[PDB]
Amino acid sequence: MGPKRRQLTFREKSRIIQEVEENPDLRKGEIARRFNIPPSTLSTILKNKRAILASERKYGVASTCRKTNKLSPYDKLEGLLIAWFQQIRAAGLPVKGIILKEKALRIAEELGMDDFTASNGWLDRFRRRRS
DNA sequence: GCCTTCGTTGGAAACGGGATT
DNA sequence: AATCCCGTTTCCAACGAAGGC
Secondary structure, three states: OOOOOOOOOHHHHHHHHHHHHHOOOOOHHHHHHHOOOOHHHHHHHHHOHHHHHHHHHHHHHHHHOOOOOOOOOOHHHHHHHHHHHHHHHHHOOOOOHHHHHHHHHHHHHHHOOOOOOOOHHHHHHHHHHOO
16 A cells, blocks of 8 residues: 655654745645645644754754654763764764774663663664654 | 644554574 | 665554443
């Protein structure tokens, strides 16, 4: 069968939002038509306006593909890890993948996440997620 | 009639860790 | 080492029924 729900990218939802703010004198149903989405869908996008724009910023160039702001159960660790290597890149230096995995396992120890393994799946997803 | 909210649940994307490039 | 794979699990978000203007 065909799809039953159309999922949109953060970039697409961002455009829809921007459309409504630049055309306050148009019927919401009119804007929904222009993007070919249920008025129901447009409303929920507008209500999540701030989260959506935050996600678009968060995913950066990946907003062109990312649709969901799903988090990893190790999200707290990912926050610390990012801040960490993002501070190294601020000095114009690259962060070796090997050092990244090492640092993640140490942060996990500190947080008490005994089940974190810095698994291949997790690392790959992180690399493509936080892109 | 227009538009949004509520609630259901479709489906994106998380997971581990062995397989593969 | 970095990626990919895949059976499974977890939970974000789309959209129709309802209901308030």
